[PDB]
Amino acid sequence: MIREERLLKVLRAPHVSEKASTAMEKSNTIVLKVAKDATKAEIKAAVQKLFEVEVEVVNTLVVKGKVKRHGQRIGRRSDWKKAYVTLKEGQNL
Amino acid sequence: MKRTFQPSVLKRNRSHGFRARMATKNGRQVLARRRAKGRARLTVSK
Amino acid sequence: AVVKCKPTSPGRRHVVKVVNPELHKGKPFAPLLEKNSKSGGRNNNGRITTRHIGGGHKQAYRIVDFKRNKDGIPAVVERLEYDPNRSANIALVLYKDGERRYILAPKGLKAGDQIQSGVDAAIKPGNTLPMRNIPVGSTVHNVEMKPGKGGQLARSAGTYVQIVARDGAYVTLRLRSGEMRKVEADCRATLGEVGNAEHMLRVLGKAGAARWRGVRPTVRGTAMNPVDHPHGGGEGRNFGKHPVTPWGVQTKGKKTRSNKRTDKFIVRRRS
RNA sequence: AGGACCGAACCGACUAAUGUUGAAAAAUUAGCGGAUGACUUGUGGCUGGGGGUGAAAGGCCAAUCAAACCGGGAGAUAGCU
RNA sequence: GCUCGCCGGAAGACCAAGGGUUCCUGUCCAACGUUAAUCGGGGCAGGGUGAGUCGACCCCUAAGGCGAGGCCGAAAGGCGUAGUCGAUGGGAAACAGGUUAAUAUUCCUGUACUUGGUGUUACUGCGAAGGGGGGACGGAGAAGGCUAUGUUGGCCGGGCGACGGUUGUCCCGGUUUAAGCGUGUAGGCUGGUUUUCCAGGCAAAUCCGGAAAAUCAAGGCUGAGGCGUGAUGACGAGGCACUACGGUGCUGAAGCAACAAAUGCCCUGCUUCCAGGAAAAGCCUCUAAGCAUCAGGUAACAUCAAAUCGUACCCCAAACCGACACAGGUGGUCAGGUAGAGAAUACCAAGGCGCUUGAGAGAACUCGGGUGAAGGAACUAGGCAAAAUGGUGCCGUAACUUCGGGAGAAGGCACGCUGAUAUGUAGGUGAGGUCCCUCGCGGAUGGAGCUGAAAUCAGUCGAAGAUACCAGCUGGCUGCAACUGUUUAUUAAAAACACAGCACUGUGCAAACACGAAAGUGGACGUAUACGGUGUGACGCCUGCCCGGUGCCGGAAGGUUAAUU
Ligand SMILES: [Mg+2]
Ligand SMILES: [Mg+2]
Ligand SMILES: [Mg+2]
Ligand SMILES: [Mg+2]
Ligand SMILES: [Mg+2]
Ligand SMILES: [Mg+2]
Ligand SMILES: [Mg+2]
Ligand SMILES: [Mg+2]
Ligand SMILES: [Mg+2]
Ligand SMILES: [Mg+2]
Ligand SMILES: [Mg+2]
Ligand SMILES: [Mg+2]
Ligand SMILES: [Mg+2]
Ligand SMILES: [Mg+2]
Ligand SMILES: [Mg+2]
Ligand SMILES: [Mg+2]
Ligand SMILES: [Mg+2]
Ligand SMILES: [Mg+2]
Ligand SMILES: [Mg+2]
Ligand SMILES: [Mg+2]
Ligand SMILES: [Mg+2]
Ligand SMILES: [Mg+2]
Ligand SMILES: [Mg+2]
Ligand SMILES: [Mg+2]
Ligand SMILES: [Mg+2]
Ligand SMILES: [Mg+2]
Ligand SMILES: [Mg+2]
Ligand SMILES: [Mg+2]
Ligand SMILES: [Mg+2]
Ligand SMILES: [Mg+2]
Ligand SMILES: [Mg+2]
Ligand SMILES: [Mg+2]
Ligand SMILES: [Mg+2]
Ligand SMILES: [Mg+2]
Ligand SMILES: [Mg+2]
Ligand SMILES: [Mg+2]
Ligand SMILES: [Mg+2]
Ligand SMILES: [Mg+2]
Ligand SMILES: [Mg+2]
Ligand SMILES: [Mg+2]
Ligand SMILES: [Mg+2]
Ligand SMILES: [Mg+2]
Ligand SMILES: [Mg+2]
Ligand SMILES: [Mg+2]
Ligand SMILES: [Mg+2]
Ligand SMILES: [Mg+2]
Ligand SMILES: [Mg+2]
Ligand SMILES: [Mg+2]
Ligand SMILES: [Mg+2]
Ligand SMILES: [Mg+2]
Ligand SMILES: [Mg+2]
């Protein structure tokens, strides 16, 4: 049983894009930005508690930040992790 | 023509990496010199 | 036994091979095998310390019993086998209690023969006794040098040792080199000559045959530059030097034995 | 069967022409040698500088080798320009 | 968009290394792109990488590394035991279809499988840091059985032709389906079973090893492919309805057989040879201490879990190594048609490209090619370069020889197409039918159908039938090195080096010798039929005289002679 503090930390933001909306309206999946070190189980528990929905499975991937060019100097955006969490076909957040 | 630098990350790390430098007295001297000079990258690992 | 190849190619014209139809054709006895990787003549410093070694066929080590210490239990020879690690052949023997073991194959031994060790063994080829119990004049092989240590003399194919004299705690032996030596009478020996005597009749026939045995080419010192060998240098073929080794020691007749610890056992040098 | 034969891949490099501020700090084109073996190749490992390694050419050791490269003695010394 | 050309054992498609956003969308054209640029691997913004089964991680080890104590060393350190790391090797498990602008064995649909934890029932001797088995292994060769795959015929849908003919022996297209599950075949290996005993496997063992009896002869293990199911599905030519013209939706016929056939699979097999061919764990089994109606084990069922990291894109290349968008280099996998021995070569398929300056003109000269009267090496240092030869089958072939060779010696003849032999032969494959049995993926006959050379005879066209591409010049005398190899990366490939063979010499094992202040290590887990050094260099006939000089070996009477005293 994961403590509530960790659950309150793991979820960062919902991800907005064409693929995300298509996944929502097709496969009943929401796409989230999660903490870099969140595991699948923590994401599952956090979504189940903070959104009071039931989840089938969580798929995660790590996105690598883009090297950018800003006025003579090279900067790099930070890596982040996003999760494809599938709802249990009857919740419809 | 086959040139001299044939890259390989495993060999690079095993020959010049941080843990290879730290393994000997002379490698630690290398690290100390590079810290004294102010190098931004001590070893090839970074 | 010894057969010449037909000269169907220049690399075959001079090959003489030694074939034994009696050798086992299957795989060796697994429980008595180990690995021995090649060295290339390199020591633990990583440096060539013996030149002209390298490559060759992969080989597995056969644990050969050189001690022959389990006494009183007769054994029967199962089969003769080829051994890559030595010039002699080895024989698999099965003891009456169910234990299997490799021994050097003496001349005349064949499958089904009985062998036995100990002080009370019959005087027959392949039997091992302390040299105190062996009649003077016998030819023996696999001779121990210190009691209980294991045979060290007369182990190569076709070799043997003669027992020439016995007095007190010592026996005088005539070694294959023609050299007479004392050993303690309690050291063990095996009766008869070690087999495969025609080993020396083979002719390799080509350079590749030597490469198959892990021998690398020898460059004559006179073909080098002076920085490489004392013999090097010259415009054309020049020698004008006393022959020496790559490290400067004279190499035609100069004696190199210097061991005062064991001089007391040498009755007469080989000469 | 074979360090057998002819011949692609593959490994080489005998001849000629081109190129020589090159397409290339060693190649291209047409021919050429080996092509089951002392073969060839991937990955990893070991040998360190008066030292290694060398089927031996003073060859090779990161486009550097009759003694590598980097830093230091060091502003060596220079009856020479 | 239409036409043209080029690659097609790659200039197509994947993977590993290496790179790191180059991927896709919108937008911009200053600089970058050897020109313009509306375009881009360029600028700016946004988007994109989804795993119990793929890989890493993980378990196990190789070479090798590090190394508690230890041994050794002025110091720094060197070596190494127990250990612990280290893949390029061993170890559980997933397939087909659909889908995005960009991911997919990861998402969705269908159908599977593996390991482990808990719980419950049933029955029970469980237990390792130990024992045994297994894992577990070479080169070459030879088939036989198959499949991938292809071709043809059936079947299905469509067609009836811009110019003579084309309702037919005509044309175009399709004719696909996996893992898993059941069956246990071609074939490979091995006798089986039950008792008793035992100096062995560090102790024990019911396991392995060994011995002795009895009995039965058929039992076990492995095994491609086929067949059935998976699959009343999915896919499917095409048709229809739309289009925001890129494409979206709907529907959907046939979906068979024969023959040929791998370098792939059975096969880690079989045969043979000598140069005699990893390790450890997972796995199976045996017990020790120990536990003892407990624990544990086995089986069935239920449930839970399978984390983390990688996943875009390039990958014979404009993205990697070469300073470049550089004619160079870069490991593995896939492998269609016609001809062909072929992965050569020519033309093509799938697929991908026209190489990031063009437009004219048609001088010398340079480069790469084509042809050439008469002559034919007169050229030149030299036939350098070029020209020529070139295939298959058959005939035929010298000196010399180490009897193998030389030898593809040299030289010569035939070669296309059509018909017949023979409406397609010899051969290969093989259905139905019939007969059997221990009835089966069975055995014997049987020959339908399919496929199908080579040869002979006759005819026939051309200047020419190995018509293109492809594809030996040959012979004679002689020096050198026996030969296959190796070498001056980048002006020298040789007569140089190596070599098998020969000889001398050292070396008795704590070997000589080499690396090392040393400990140690190699030599070698070898033992004089072995190992080191040196010279010569297959083979044949041979290898003469000199010990004065210089080395080396032996001797020790005498002369001389150090430290020491
Ligand atoms: Mg999933
Ligand atoms: Mg993932
Ligand atoms: Mg030698
Ligand atoms: Mg020699
Ligand atoms: Mg020379
Ligand atoms: Mg010298
Ligand atoms: Mg001379
Ligand atoms: Mg002279
Ligand atoms: Mg050959
Ligand atoms: Mg070379
Ligand atoms: Mg070429
Ligand atoms: Mg060839
Ligand atoms: Mg020279
Ligand atoms: Mg160089
Ligand atoms: Mg110097
Ligand atoms: Mg000074
Ligand atoms: Mg100066
Ligand atoms: Mg073409
Ligand atoms: Mg960028
Ligand atoms: Mg793009
Ligand atoms: Mg403009
Ligand atoms: Mg421009
Ligand atoms: Mg861009
Ligand atoms: Mg180790
Ligand atoms: Mg160590
Ligand atoms: Mg210590
Ligand atoms: Mg480990
Ligand atoms: Mg691996
Ligand atoms: Mg893609
Ligand atoms: Mg088939
Ligand atoms: Mg991809
Ligand atoms: Mg370009
Ligand atoms: Mg290029
Ligand atoms: Mg290559
Ligand atoms: Mg081709
Ligand atoms: Mg012109
Ligand atoms: Mg011209
Ligand atoms: Mg011409
Ligand atoms: Mg002419
Ligand atoms: Mg003419
Ligand atoms: Mg003429
Ligand atoms: Mg002339
Ligand atoms: Mg002239
Ligand atoms: Mg020529
Ligand atoms: Mg020509
Ligand atoms: Mg002459
Ligand atoms: Mg030669
Ligand atoms: Mg050169
Ligand atoms: Mg050259
Ligand atoms: Mg030793
Ligand atoms: Mg010579």
In the block, residue with structure tokens 């969580």: A58
* A20: DSSP letter: H
* C264: DSSP letter: G
What domain range includes position C266? 195-271
Same domain, C105 and C42: yes
Identify the residues numbered 79 to 138 in chain C whose C-beta atom is closer than 7 Å to any atom of strand E: 82, 84-88, 94, 96-100
**C-alpha A24 chain-centroid distance:** 13
The footprint of strand D (CB < 7 Å) covers B 1, 3-6, 8, 10-11, 14; C 8-12, 15, 42, 45-48, 51, 54, 206-209, 211-212, 216-217, 219, 223-229
For C116, other C-beta atoms within 10 Å of its C-beta total 21
Task: Round and report the angstrom distance from CA (C185) to C1' (E33).
Answer: 94
What domain range includes position A30? 2-93
Cα–Cα distance measured from residue A38 to residue A48, given in angstroms and rounded to the nearest whole number? 15
Same domain, C26 and C131: no
Handedness of CA C122, C126, C131, C136 (dihedral sign): positive
- Contact predicate C193/C106, CB 8 Å: yes
Domain boundary at C125, C159, C194, which? Answer: C194
Same domain, C62 and C145: no
Task: Round and report the angstrom distance from CA (C178) to C1' (E539).
Answer: 34
Q: Is the CB of A77 under 7 A from strand E?
A: no
Angle at C189 between CA C185 and CA C192, to 5 degrees: 130
A29 CA to centre of ligand 4 in angstroms? 79
C217 CA to centre of ligand 10 in angstroms? 18
Same domain, C1 and C85: yes
Question: What is the CATH number for C59?
Answer: 2.40.50.140
Structural domains in chain B?
A: 1-46 (1.10.287.3980)
C69 forms bridges with which residues in the sheet? none
Which residues, 6 or more positions from B43, have their beta carbon under 8 angstroms from its beta carbon? B16, B17, B18, B21, B31
Same domain, C2 and C98: yes
Same domain, C203 and C231: yes
Kindly compute the dihedral angle of the four CA atoms of residues C259, C265, C268, C271, in this order, to the nearest 10 degrees: -40
Same domain, C42 and C139: no
Task: Please state whether beta strands C161-167 and C139-141 pair in parallel, antiparallel, or not at all (unpaired).
Answer: antiparallel
Domain boundary at C113, C147, C171, which? Answer: C113
Same domain, C52 and C70: yes
* C198: DSSP letter: G
Same domain, C213 and C271: yes
Question: Which nt sits closest to B10, CA to C1'?
Answer: D44
Which residues, 6 or more positions from A63, have their beta carbon under 8 angstroms from its beta carbon? A79, A80, A81, A82
Give chains near C: 3+ CB pairs under 8 A.
none
Q: Is the CB of C260 under 7 A from strand E?
A: no
Same domain, C180 and C243: no
Alpha helix locations (H) across C176-262? 207-212
Task: Please state whether beta strands C139-141 and C180-184 pair in parallel, antiparallel, or not at all (unpaired).
Answer: unpaired
Task: Round and report the angstrom distance from CA (C176) to C1' (E55).
Answer: 62
C189 forms bridges with which residues in the sheet? C129
Cα–Cα distance measured from residue C148 to residue C138, given in angstroms and rounded to the nearest whole number? 21
Domain boundary at C194, C219, C237, which? Answer: C194
Handedness of CA C221, C224, C229, C232 (dihedral sign): positive
Q: Is the CB of A74 under 7 A from strand E?
A: no
- Contact predicate A56/A40, CB 8 Å: no
CA–CA distances in Å: residue C212 to residues A44, C119, C166: 65, 43, 45
The residue whose CA lies nearest the C1' of nucleotide E482 is C10
B1 CA to centre of ligand 34 in angstroms? 11
Q: How many domains does chain A have?
A: 1
Question: What is the CATH number for C267?
Answer: 4.10.950.10
Angle at C89 between CA C84 and CA C94, to 5 degrees: 110
Handedness of CA A33, A37, A39, A44 (dihedral sign): negative
Write the burial class of residue C168 (CB in 10 Å: 0-12 exposed, 13-18 middle, 19+ buried): exposed
Which two tokens mark C75?
């054994």
Which two tokens mark C208?
């590749």
Q: How many domains does chain C have?
A: 3
Same domain, C213 and C235: yes
Same domain, C173 and C95: no
- Contact predicate C90/C81, CB 8 Å: yes
